[PDB]
């Protein structure tokens, strides 16, 4: 897992996100959808968004960004002791939403990109290393639940 020092870096970085949860959430989803248009097709409520302008202007997209990052933040604050929080998310994403694990890799990469974009020069090598590890742990625990379900 992550060391105590690594968790402290993760949660320090997360303070930056919490100062503007909707803004970070919106940018993460826009990075995901523009980089990987197939992902948009999993959202019946966003498939009408035909341009980035329309995405940027969507209050509902910002709302979902808030829901996503709030869930992720609750998970990160558990510092790996996240079974109860993570199991239901993994199961809804496999069974209801049909989200392949590759798309979770995509959104993980989008989070790292958005952190650099919004905090250039303020997201250092140690911070990126710790946040990467945290997102890998998140993805890996979801993947174990996916394997249990035989999903993908
Ligand atoms: C950081 C990773 C993610 C987190 C924390 C997250 C969290 C959530 C939460 C809390 C919900 C609402 C509750 C639920 O249905 O379980 C949700 C819904 C949903 N998620 Fe995610 N999600 C993540 C990644 C993804 C990705 C990568 C996709 C697709 C590419 C996706 C697709 C969906 C869809 C289609 C819904 C239903 C939206 C609606 O119609 O209301 N999620 N997610």
Short mmCIF file of C-alpha atoms and ligand atoms in Angstrom, two decimals:
data_model
loop_
_atom_site.label_atom_id
_atom_site.label_comp_id
_atom_site.label_asym_id
_atom_site.label_seq_id
_atom_site.Cartn_x
_atom_site.Cartn_y
_atom_site.Cartn_z
CA UNK A 1 0.00 0.00 0.00
CA UNK A 2 0.98 3.62 0.66
CA UNK A 3 3.22 4.79 3.46
CA UNK A 4 1.97 7.26 6.07
CA UNK A 5 4.04 9.97 4.33
CA UNK A 6 2.46 9.07 1.00
CA UNK A 7 -1.06 9.24 2.42
CA UNK A 8 -0.24 12.66 3.88
CA UNK A 9 0.78 13.86 0.42
CA UNK A 10 -2.39 12.41 -1.11
CA UNK A 11 -4.60 14.22 1.37
CA UNK A 12 -2.61 17.47 1.00
CA UNK A 13 -3.21 17.33 -2.75
CA UNK A 14 -6.87 16.59 -2.08
CA UNK A 15 -7.15 19.87 -0.12
CA UNK A 16 -6.49 21.62 -3.45
CA UNK A 17 -9.40 19.77 -5.08
CA UNK A 18 -11.74 20.50 -2.15
CA UNK A 19 -11.28 24.26 -2.58
CA UNK A 20 -13.14 23.93 -5.91
CA UNK A 21 -14.76 20.52 -6.11
CA UNK A 22 -17.18 21.36 -8.96
CA UNK A 23 -14.45 23.01 -11.05
CA UNK A 24 -12.08 20.07 -10.68
CA UNK A 25 -14.94 17.60 -11.30
CA UNK A 26 -16.12 19.35 -14.43
CA UNK A 27 -12.57 19.48 -15.86
CA UNK A 28 -11.97 15.79 -15.10
CA UNK A 29 -15.13 14.73 -16.94
CA UNK A 30 -14.43 17.03 -19.86
CA UNK A 31 -10.86 15.65 -20.17
CA UNK A 32 -12.32 12.13 -20.09
CA UNK A 33 -15.08 12.75 -22.64
CA UNK A 34 -12.95 14.75 -25.10
CA UNK A 35 -9.97 12.38 -24.85
CA UNK A 36 -12.12 9.24 -25.03
CA UNK A 37 -15.49 9.93 -26.74
CA UNK A 38 -16.60 6.33 -26.22
CA UNK A 39 -16.91 7.16 -22.53
CA UNK A 40 -19.58 9.78 -23.19
CA UNK A 41 -21.77 7.01 -24.63
CA UNK A 42 -22.04 5.42 -21.19
CA UNK A 43 -23.91 8.51 -19.94
CA UNK A 44 -27.41 8.76 -21.35
CA UNK A 45 -27.57 12.18 -19.65
CA UNK A 46 -24.46 13.58 -21.34
CA UNK A 47 -24.60 12.02 -24.82
CA UNK A 48 -26.46 15.16 -26.04
CA UNK A 49 -23.26 17.14 -25.38
CA UNK A 50 -21.87 17.44 -28.89
CA UNK A 51 -19.16 20.07 -28.29
CA UNK A 52 -16.77 21.08 -25.52
CA UNK A 53 -18.58 24.43 -25.25
CA UNK A 54 -21.78 22.54 -24.50
CA UNK A 55 -19.91 20.42 -21.92
CA UNK A 56 -18.44 23.51 -20.26
CA UNK A 57 -21.89 25.14 -20.14
CA UNK A 58 -23.60 22.08 -18.61
CA UNK A 59 -24.60 22.65 -14.96
CA UNK A 60 -25.60 19.01 -14.73
CA UNK A 61 -22.12 17.90 -15.78
CA UNK A 62 -20.69 20.07 -13.01
CA UNK A 63 -23.18 18.50 -10.60
CA UNK A 64 -22.05 15.00 -11.59
CA UNK A 65 -18.43 16.08 -11.29
CA UNK A 66 -19.19 17.08 -7.70
CA UNK A 67 -20.83 13.70 -6.97
CA UNK A 68 -17.84 11.84 -8.49
CA UNK A 69 -15.13 13.72 -6.69
CA UNK A 70 -17.04 13.69 -3.39
CA UNK A 71 -17.23 9.89 -3.59
CA UNK A 72 -13.53 9.65 -4.49
CA UNK A 73 -12.56 12.01 -1.65
CA UNK A 74 -14.44 9.95 0.92
CA UNK A 75 -12.58 6.90 -0.36
CA UNK A 76 -9.15 8.59 -0.28
CA UNK A 77 -9.71 9.80 3.28
CA UNK A 78 -10.02 6.15 4.33
CA UNK A 79 -6.35 5.66 3.42
CA UNK A 80 -6.94 2.22 1.92
CA UNK A 81 -9.41 0.98 4.55
CA UNK A 82 -12.16 1.55 2.01
CA UNK A 83 -13.92 -1.79 1.41
CA UNK A 84 -17.37 -0.56 2.52
CA UNK A 85 -17.17 2.59 0.40
CA UNK A 86 -15.54 0.96 -2.61
CA UNK A 87 -17.47 -2.33 -2.97
CA UNK A 88 -20.84 -0.63 -3.82
CA UNK A 89 -19.18 1.73 -6.31
CA UNK A 90 -17.42 -1.14 -8.01
CA UNK A 91 -20.64 -3.11 -8.18
CA UNK A 92 -22.78 -0.24 -9.56
CA UNK A 93 -20.10 0.54 -12.17
CA UNK A 94 -19.85 -3.09 -13.35
CA UNK A 95 -23.45 -4.20 -13.15
CA UNK A 96 -25.57 -1.07 -13.70
CA UNK A 97 -23.30 1.29 -15.63
CA UNK A 98 -21.19 -1.28 -17.52
CA UNK A 99 -17.92 0.65 -17.19
CA UNK A 100 -14.88 -1.33 -18.29
CA UNK A 101 -11.81 -1.03 -16.05
CA UNK A 102 -9.95 0.74 -18.91
CA UNK A 103 -12.31 3.71 -18.49
CA UNK A 104 -11.27 3.88 -14.81
CA UNK A 105 -7.68 4.03 -16.03
CA UNK A 106 -8.73 6.87 -18.33
CA UNK A 107 -10.34 8.89 -15.53
CA UNK A 108 -7.34 8.25 -13.25
CA UNK A 109 -5.06 9.75 -15.89
CA UNK A 110 -7.50 12.64 -16.36
CA UNK A 111 -7.29 13.46 -12.62
CA UNK A 112 -3.48 13.65 -12.82
CA UNK A 113 -3.74 15.85 -15.92
CA UNK A 114 -6.26 18.22 -14.36
CA UNK A 115 -4.14 18.56 -11.21
CA UNK A 116 -1.18 19.72 -13.29
CA UNK A 117 -3.36 21.94 -15.44
CA UNK A 118 -5.00 23.74 -12.51
CA UNK A 119 -1.89 23.80 -10.30
CA UNK A 120 1.09 24.14 -12.65
CA UNK A 121 4.33 24.10 -10.71
CA UNK A 122 2.35 23.28 -7.50
CA UNK A 123 1.90 19.51 -8.01
CA UNK A 124 5.41 18.19 -7.44
CA UNK A 125 7.08 14.90 -8.29
CA UNK A 126 6.47 13.44 -4.80
CA UNK A 127 2.81 14.56 -4.86
CA UNK A 128 2.23 13.05 -8.31
CA UNK A 129 3.86 9.78 -7.16
CA UNK A 130 1.61 9.54 -4.09
CA UNK A 131 -1.62 10.47 -5.92
CA UNK A 132 -0.76 7.97 -8.67
CA UNK A 133 -0.35 5.21 -6.06
CA UNK A 134 -3.66 6.13 -4.43
CA UNK A 135 -5.50 6.02 -7.76
CA UNK A 136 -3.83 2.72 -8.66
CA UNK A 137 -4.96 1.26 -5.33
CA UNK A 138 -8.49 2.50 -6.01
CA UNK A 139 -8.48 1.02 -9.52
CA UNK A 140 -6.95 -2.25 -8.38
CA UNK A 141 -9.50 -2.81 -5.64
CA UNK A 142 -12.30 -2.09 -8.15
CA UNK A 143 -10.70 -4.57 -10.56
CA UNK A 144 -10.78 -7.29 -7.87
CA UNK A 145 -14.54 -6.73 -7.49
CA UNK A 146 -14.91 -6.79 -11.28
CA UNK A 147 -13.12 -10.15 -11.43
CA UNK A 148 -15.46 -11.52 -8.75
CA UNK A 149 -18.44 -10.52 -10.94
CA UNK A 150 -16.79 -11.79 -14.14
CA UNK A 151 -17.24 -8.33 -15.59
CA UNK A 152 -15.33 -7.59 -18.82
C1 LIG B 1 -13.06 8.22 -9.98
C2 LIG B 1 -13.82 7.23 -10.50
C3 LIG B 1 -15.35 7.29 -10.37
C4 LIG B 1 -16.09 7.59 -9.28
C5 LIG B 1 -15.61 7.93 -7.85
C6 LIG B 1 -17.47 7.52 -9.68
C7 LIG B 1 -18.56 7.75 -8.86
C8 LIG B 1 -19.89 7.71 -9.19
C9 LIG B 1 -21.02 7.93 -8.30
C10 LIG B 1 -20.88 8.24 -6.80
C11 LIG B 1 -22.14 7.78 -9.03
C12 LIG B 1 -23.61 7.87 -8.56
C13 LIG B 1 -23.91 6.58 -7.77
C14 LIG B 1 -23.80 5.30 -8.57
O1 LIG B 1 -24.53 5.14 -9.58
O2 LIG B 1 -23.02 4.39 -8.16
C15 LIG B 1 -21.73 7.47 -10.39
C16 LIG B 1 -22.60 7.27 -11.43
C17 LIG B 1 -22.27 6.97 -12.73
N1 LIG B 1 -21.00 6.71 -13.22
FE1 LIG B 1 -19.26 6.94 -12.11
N2 LIG B 1 -17.55 7.15 -11.01
C18 LIG B 1 -16.26 7.01 -11.46
C19 LIG B 1 -15.92 6.66 -12.75
C20 LIG B 1 -16.76 6.48 -13.82
C21 LIG B 1 -16.37 6.34 -15.21
C22 LIG B 1 -14.90 6.34 -15.64
C23 LIG B 1 -17.51 6.22 -15.93
C24 LIG B 1 -17.71 6.05 -17.46
C25 LIG B 1 -16.74 6.16 -18.36
C26 LIG B 1 -18.63 6.28 -15.01
C27 LIG B 1 -19.95 6.17 -15.34
C28 LIG B 1 -21.04 6.43 -14.57
C29 LIG B 1 -22.39 6.51 -15.05
C30 LIG B 1 -22.96 6.29 -16.47
C31 LIG B 1 -23.20 6.87 -13.83
C32 LIG B 1 -24.72 7.11 -13.82
C33 LIG B 1 -24.92 8.59 -14.14
C34 LIG B 1 -26.38 8.98 -14.14
O3 LIG B 1 -27.06 8.74 -15.17
O4 LIG B 1 -26.84 9.53 -13.10
N3 LIG B 1 -18.12 6.46 -13.75
N4 LIG B 1 -20.35 7.44 -10.46
#
